[PDB]
Every structure is written in structure tokens, then in C-alpha cells.
Nucleic acid binder design. Structure first.
Lengths: 578, 341, 117
DNA sequence: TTGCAAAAGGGC
DNA sequence: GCCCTTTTGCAA
């Protein structure tokens, strides 16, 4: 409750006002110190500001030659702690530079910066206690002379810290965050690999699931790190977190290794996991969805450009009508069989008025005889059925799922409106078609979302990995989503690991930030250019590779950046369990 | 609780100067009633944003042809040919019947008692049996009939028995010989148009610009364009909105665009804007572009960067203003409460 | 109220030197009479601004191409090819005849005796 | 005769 | 590098 030093100057440097501070020998001998980046309270003329130590350097005070004095003392082995008090006092000094960030006025309102430069004689600098730190962290910007919102419930996110320095942690000072900040707003999660990105993403998702039970999630799981704890650590996955929280029937895992994944889920969750996770296939049965097969074959040409063949065009446009003509459905099924798709055991095809079981070789031969011995485009399709060769990788008999439609139903179902399903897509199981399927699914989801405008909002969040790969294309569906999702109630949460690759438009328009250690200079420079408040922590990010250390900044009513030590998912689960 | 334009007009006592074009007129009229009393008919005049495509197959064809075209963005050849030959086909009853049948196959419910002449026979596609007879009975329109499934998305905008063309209605409202003066506040509820908002907005803009160019030498357009998020429409140096921004002063057409990011707006437009109202900006690039465009903002760039205050604005009205003046723009409530004295 | 060039020439006494090209001849003539008095015909001559696209078909192609992409986007490939190779087509009588036929189909009245090969 | 696939040379 | 053309061959 007393000043830490004596202010000996002040000025306006650029857009900010700074004042110099000097620590006296008596204080330096009592252990008093200041850490770079620390927050201190400045009292000037009956008002309280918020400071932040920015620099530290040694400089002589008064008339003295510290170099000569110290050299002479050293050569005589004089110990300057208990032998030459006058010599120690004449040279023991140290300078610090502080920057004023604003003041907390009225009931929690924040007034940025200052227009009054404080006089040196009346300026005092104090150290800030835990209660003051908490109340400072709990403040945000407001219009004017207005009472606080008194919003919804808040959940602890982390506690303040100043790096690995001892005495630089304040576990009792916790930044409380309302999960609504993550709904319908695009978030950025930068940082090197294996530095807590997965932990903070899981914590955010758990908070959203617990708080807003009416919001769905589309998790494009590239690394298979979100469903269950990986065989590399012990941190629980989303499924285990949901089990602990007692949330039932909200996960829908789409994969192609259902047996292995069910085995893993059983071994990690028990036997009642069917009450939590519904495993669904990623393999389609084109003998139930000829419309889907034809659409894929036809749109392949257009995605490669050039005019598609007329027979494919008219087949794609008229398959629905052809479904009422068995004499043409037989042609379509024969074309698929010639392409090579293996049909289910016992399939019967009715040509003319005869029944054939194309699953049998001799029956297939007889059907071929009957067909070869112009009903729309069916004959042309049967002739050129070699075009459907590439679909053998996507085909598996007896599926009748059409995950591309099941996902849309889950995410935008009127009968499903409420308690949004957490769709988790196991991408690594799709080999080289993962990007193709991801783009197709995202495009068809965005189209449905735009169509449903006015009747209801999409109300789901998209989780993205390696966002620099998908956001590089300015004409891409993912770029369009990043630009316009908020309008239709579609959020985003992308972790890139390299901010420089993400376009400046996306960087500028992002609302939330969670930055961890960055290794390159270009990334830090682009981050500072994108957001002004990140101009003070560039050096720390550049040259402090600390695991679990994050700088959080949530737009638009947050005064400054805060360095946090994000809480672990285990402790978050235990806290919520109460 | 900030009042809207309708409430402000009611407070000021101005009647019959608003025209609200919406696709949800029911809900909007209910809200207008609740917020303005039982006599809201004298202030807001709701109008629909739907048409009957059987009167405007040209509009239907244009809408189909101007879709997103994901991946391969090659417009259909048949659709292009129809777009270019529908005017000639309007003199061939057979081709017109093909087009009407294509629409019906798409699924657009027609008026009560539509008449068609496939070869020489009266057909009433309003009647299911006649529709089936014509379909079983069935040059340029045959391709459209075969691909009629493309028009499936027009149900969100179709409305039987309308014959309105809100485009023509708005053109007349804003530049009609009878309505010379007396003004008209035309408010478009663009979001209710779904995915056709871009098409309709661009078409209306070019229509109005062409009409104003026609009016040159006789009278001025005398109206203002309010554009929101102008970085989407002013980006393209060939778009109609860029053309308007660059050339509207000659025909008496104003503009008022809000972007939130001066970096995106072209420097050609930035250098030629007269009025400015700059609030907090959080990008050194934005501040740099602003300073480059206008010298006087060099005295306030720093405060713009560092001070995020709400309702605090710097105003500079060219060309005869000495310097930049910071202001606390008055609240609309206070403006209304003072305008009545 | 700064005097215009026509009024300056009136004051200086210069005659028969200004030839004004406009597409609103009637309105401009009204204004000229109002400002220069009855005898304004001595000082200023008003002429139209109409051209024969047959003799300048590159102008027609450029005008059409500009008109497209201003009411939308994605101008046709054929239109782009014509816009960029009408100079080539100038020495091909077949393509020239096709272009002239396209103009006549559009409906522009051509000068009498315009013969193609 | 036409439509469609697949390889190789031209223009920009 | 990228984007259209011409040619041959096998349907029909």
C-alpha cells in the first residue's frame, strides 16, 4: 500500500503516454522488483490508471562514475553487501518504463488511453493486489453513463501469469468468459504444434456444449484427436468429457472403420457407450442412390471444366422421371454393374417383365443378353457405363445411408430442431477423397443454410484444422463461409499454426484470438498489423517458447490483451461436475 | 430501443413517403401495427417482392442463367439461347407452350385457368387432366422442357396472379413523370429475397442508372442511394455500383456507403468522396489509407488507432472545412424531440 | 455566374467558330437562346452525336462487351473471341458477312447499297 | 452422320 | 503454363 518508486518523467510517445520510474537502493535491497509485462496501478491527481512495465535499463543517477567505482571496489575484493554501504548506495539504482493503458471509470466501464499527461511530482506508482487485478480483468467497454448488462453465467478459463518467472503466477486471478462469445463468431487459434491448441479447443467445445444445448457442431477432425484420448497422452476426448458431464445422444461419428472405433469406444467408455456415440458409415451404396452416383459422375466433368456429355446431363436431370420406368432403371443398374460396383446378395432386376438377380453371374449374363437383344438416354448410359469406374472406391453393399444427406438432416432438421447433434467426421479414413468430400459437404450445407433464411437459423459451429489450406482460395466455399457465416448463424474456429498465410480480410474481421508461441517473424508481424493491441507481446511471442501459455483477446469490448495459463480439461470437468 | 425511420416519420408527422418492399409482408405489417398503432396505413405502404413468372419468363430465364455455377462456371448453352431468343419465341404459340410446360414441370403453380395451344388445341394447365394430356402429347424450347428441373428454386419467389414487376414499380416511383418531386423513401428488405438479392439489386441499379441517363438534359434524378457494406459492391471496377459512385454526380445521384474498412475501398473512390464520418479503426493499414486520401486526418490518426470510444466521431465535410472536428453525434431521440419545436 | 466560353466569344465578337456536339439538341438550343439572345445561331452550331456502326463494328463489339459484365459477369466466350479477334475477322469476308448479318438481325438500318461478298 | 474418348500440336 | 484444335477410332 505504498509506492514502489519515484516517478522522474513522463511524455506522450506515439499514441500512448509513458512515464519513467526509478527504483531506489533501499527498495532494491528489500527484494522489490518489476517484471516486464507486469500490470501496475498509477495514481495521478486523484485518478487511478492501469500501467504495464515495458522496459528496463541501468543509468547513473546524480554525479557519479559507477564503472570506475565498481572496478576499484572489485580489484580490492571489497564485498558490496556488508562492507561499503556508501559505495553500494551511490550506484544501486535501476530505471523502468511504464505505459498507461487507460482507467476504470464508473461501474466497470473502461476509458482507453488518456488525454492528460501526468505531472511528475504528483505521480505515484503502486503495486496491484489480487482483488484489484480481478476487478480489472472483469471490466470492459460500454457506451456511456450506463449500468452493466449483468449477462448470463460465466465459466473460468484460466489465471493470469507473467511467463515462467517465479512469483509471476496468480492462480486466484481467473479470467471468466461467457461461451456466447464463441457462438456465431469466427475465432482464430494460432500457435506452434503441441502447445495446448487441442486442450483449449476441447475446453471451448465443452463449454459450448454445457452452456448452449441448442447449438450443433461440425468437427472436421483431421487428426482424430477430438473423439477419444489419443494413444499419446491422458487428456480426455470429447466423448469422455460428455460422458462425465452426463450428456446423452448428442454425438454422431461418421467413419469407415466402425469396427475398430467401436472397439476403442467400448474399451475406453464401458459397455453403455451406445447411449452416447452413434457410429455411422462413410461408405455409400450406389445401388440405392443412382441420383447421387449420376450427380457425382456428371459434376466431375464440370469441376474439371469443359462441357459435360449430353447423355450424362439429361440422365442427371431426368433420373427422377426414369425411376418410374423399370425398362430404364434396368439400363441404369446394368450400367452400374458393368462399371463394376458389387451389388448386394439377392438383388433382383425386372427387365421387360422378367426377373433377374444380377448378383449371380449366369443371371447377369442372361440380363446382358436380353438388354443387347432408344429409351431415352438409358441405352447410352449402359453403353458408356465405363464412366462409373471411379466409384468403386466409394461403394459398399448394404449401406442405405447417404451420409451427405444424413449430415444435412442432422444439422438443419426441423424435426431435429433443438439439441444440436455434434457431428464428428473422421477424415483420415477417406484416403485421397477427403478434401473432395469435405468441399462437397460444406457446399451443400451452406446452400441449405442460405435457403432456410427467414424460417430458422443454422445455429451450428464449424471446426477447422490447417485453415491456411482451405482459406487460401478466395473463391472457395470455406472462404465464403468465413466471410458470410455470421449472417446465417454459422460460426467458425480455425487453427492455422501460420497466420501469415490467412488473408488479411479474414484476420481483420476475426473476433476472438488465442495466440501461443510463434516461431517466425512474419507471423508476428502480420498479427501486429492485423490487430493493434497485440503490439506489446510480439517480443514475448517471438522469444518465449512456453507450453500452455496463451495470450487471449476477445473482441469487440475488451480493453487490452491478457496473458493466461489456460485451465486443463480435467479440472474444467471437475469444476462443472459440481 | 433506437427508433427506426417509420417511427421517426410518425413523430415528425410525415405521411405517405415510405414504400416497404418485402417478402414477409404479413409479419412486417403485424410489427408495424404493434409499433405504430392502428393507423400505420398512413405512414408505411407495404408491397410484395414476389411476381408471377408466367408473365416474366424472361426474368425466370435470367434468374436461372445467373446462378452461382459452382466449380465449372459455364452457363448452360440452352439457357443462354433461350435468354437470347425468348423475344422471338413469344410470337410462336408452340414455343410459348413449351416454355409454360417447362415452368409447370419445374413446379410453379399457374393462375386459375391458364390457356395453352400445343399444336392447335386449347390446354388448361391449371387443370391436372389437361396438363397430363399436354404432357403426353409432348426447336429451342424442347431443350428447356427437357431441363425444366432447373427452375425448381423459383418457387421461393413465385406468386400466381401478380403481374406487378416491382422493378418497374420502383423505377416509376423514383423517376416517374407524374411523381416529379414529392420524394419517395424506398426501403428494400433485401434479406427476404434469399439468394436472388444480388441479382435483383444489380438489375434494379442498372435500370435506374439507365433511366437517369435518359433523363439527362431535362431534369435530374434527385435521389440518394444508401449502401451497406459497400466493400462488396465497390470492389469491382466494372460493376454498376462502382460506375454509380464514379459518375452519379453528373445526373444528380448521391450515395452513402458504410464499409468499416477503408483499406478495401478503391483509392479512386476514396480520393473523390466529399463527406467523412470516421469512428474507431483498429488497423494501421486502414489509418494509412485514410491519411493518404485526406491530409487533415494526420492530426487524429493516433487517437483513431488508440481510442475505442462508442458514439465518438470525426467529421470532415469538403471542400470548405478548415480542419477535422471531433463530435458526439446527437441521438436520434433527441433530434426528433427537438425537431418538433 | 462565371461566363462560359460561348458567352466569352460573344463578348469578344468572334463568330462561326464553335460547333457543339450533343445528344440533347433541343434543350441545349433552349439554353443557348436564353443566355445568348435571339441571334445565338451566329456564334454556336449544334450538331448530333450519332454514328454508323456498320463502318465501325469494333465499336459495336466493344460496346456490347462493356454492357455485359456491367449487369452481371462472365461474358460469353464467343463474345470475348469476337471482341479480341474482330481485327483478324476484318480480312475474312465470311466472318465479315456473318458480323454484318448479326447487326442487321439486331435491327440497325444500313446505308443503301451496302453489299457483302 | 453423330457423339464421345484420348493423344498431340498451336496461341496467348 | 495454360488454354483451345485437329485427328483417329468406336460407338450407334
Amino acid at each position: 500500500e505504498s509506492p514502489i518508486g519515484v516517478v522522474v518523467s513522463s511524455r506522450r510517445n506515439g499514441p500512448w503516454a509513458e512515464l519513467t520510474l526509478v527504483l531506489t537502493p533501499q527498495e532494491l535491497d528489500q527484494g522489490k522488483r518489476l517484471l516486464l509485462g507486469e500490470l501496475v496501478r498509477v495514481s495521478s491527481g486523484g485518478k487511478d490508471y492501469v500501467g504495464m512495465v515495458l522496459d528496463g535499463y541501468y543509468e547513473p543517477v546524480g554525479r557519479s562514475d559507477p564503472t570506475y567505482t565498481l572496478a576499484l571496489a572489485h580489484i580490492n575484493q571489497v564485498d558490496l553487501e556488508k562492507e561499503d554501504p556508501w559505495a553500494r548506495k551511490e550506484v544501486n539504482f535501476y530505471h523502468h518504463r511504464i505505459v498507461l493503458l487507460g482507467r476504470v471509470v464508473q461501474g466497470g466501464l473502461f476509458a482507453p488511453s488518456t488525454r492528460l499527461l501526468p505531472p511528475v511530482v504528483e505521480a505515484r506508482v503502486y503495486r496491484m493486489t489480487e482483488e484489484e487485478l480481478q476487478r480489472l480483468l472483469a471490466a470492459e467497454v460500454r457506451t456511456s453513463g450506463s449500468v452493466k448488462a449483468e449477462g448470463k453465467r460465466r465459466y473460468a478459463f484460466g489465471h493470469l501469469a507473467y511467463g515462467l518467472e517465479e512469483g509471476g503466477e496468480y492462480p486466484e486471478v481467473v479470467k471468466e468468459v461467457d461461451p456466447a462469445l464463441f457462438v456465431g463468431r469466427r475465432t482464430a487459434n494460432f500457435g506452434k504444434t503441441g502447445f495446448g491448441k487441442s486442450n483449449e479447443n476441447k475446453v471451448i467445445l465443452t463449454l459450448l456444449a454445457h452452456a448452449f444445448p441448442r447449438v450443433g457442431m461440425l468437427i472436421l477432425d483431421q487428426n482424430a484427436e477430438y473423439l477419444l484420448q489419443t494413444e499419446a497422452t491422458t487428456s480426455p476426448g470429447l466423448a469422455q468429457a460428455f460422458k462425465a458431464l452426463g450428456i446423452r445422444g448428442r454425438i454422431r461419428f461418421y467413419t469407415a472403420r466402425e469396427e475398430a472405433w467401436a472397439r476403442r469406444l467400448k474399451e475406453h467408455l464401458g459397455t453403455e457407450w451406445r447411449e452416447y456415440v452413434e457410429v455411422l458409415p462413410l461408405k455409400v451404396d450406389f445401388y440405392h442412390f443412382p441420383e447421387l452416383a449420376v450427380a457425382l459422375a456428371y459434376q466431375r466433368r464440370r469441376l474439371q471444366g469443359a462441357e459435360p456429355p449430353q447423355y450424362l446431363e439429361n440422365a442427371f436431370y431426368n433420373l427422377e422421371d426414369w425411376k418410374h420406368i423399370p425398362d430404364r432403371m434396368a439400363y441404369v443398374y446394368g450400367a452400374l454393374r458393368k462399371a463394376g460396383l458389387t451389388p448386394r446378395k439377392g438383388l433382383k432386376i425386372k427387365y421387360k417383365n422378367e426377373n433377374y438377380d444380377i448378383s449371380e453371374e449366369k443371371s447377369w449374363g442372361n440380363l446382358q443378353e436380353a438388354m443387347e437383344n432408344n429409351k431415352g438416354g438409358a441405352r447410352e448410359l449402359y453403353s458408356r457405363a465405363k464412366v462409373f469406374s471411379f466409384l468403386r472406391a466409394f461403394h459398399a453393399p448394404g449401406k442405405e445411408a447417404n451420409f451427405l444427406e444424413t449430415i444435412k438432416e442432422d444439422l438443419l432438421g426441423e424435426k431435429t430442431e433443438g439439441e444440436g447433434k455434434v457431428v464428428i467426421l473422421d477424415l483420415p479414413s477417406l484416403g485421397e477423397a477427403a478434401d473432395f468430400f469435405t468441399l462437397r459437404l460444406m457446399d451443400l450445407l451452406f446452400d441449405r443454410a442460405v435457403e432456410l433464411y427467414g424460417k430458422r437459423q443454422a445455429n451450428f459451429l464449424v471446426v477447422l484444422e490447417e485453415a491456411h489450406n482451405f482459406l487460401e482460395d478466395k473463391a472457395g466455399i470455406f472462404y465464403r463461409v468465413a466471410k458470410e457465416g455470421r449472417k446465417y448463424g454459422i460460426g467458425m474456429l480455425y487453427s492455422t499454426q501460420s497466420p501469415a498465410s490467412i488473408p488479411m480480410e479474414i484476420l481483420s474481421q476475426t473476433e476472438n484470438f488465442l495466440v501461443k508461441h510463434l516461431s517466425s517473424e512474419e507471423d508476428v508481424k502480420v498479427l501486429k498489423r492485423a490487430k493493434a493491441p497485440f503490439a506489446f507481446v510480439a517480443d514475448f511471442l517471438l522469444s518465449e517458447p512456453i507450453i500452455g501459455y496463451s495470450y487471449v483477446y476477445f473482441e469487440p469490448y475488451q480493453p487490452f490483451v491478457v496473458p493466461l495459463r489456460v485451465k486443463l480439461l480435467e479440472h474444467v470437468l471437475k469444476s462443472l461436475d459440481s
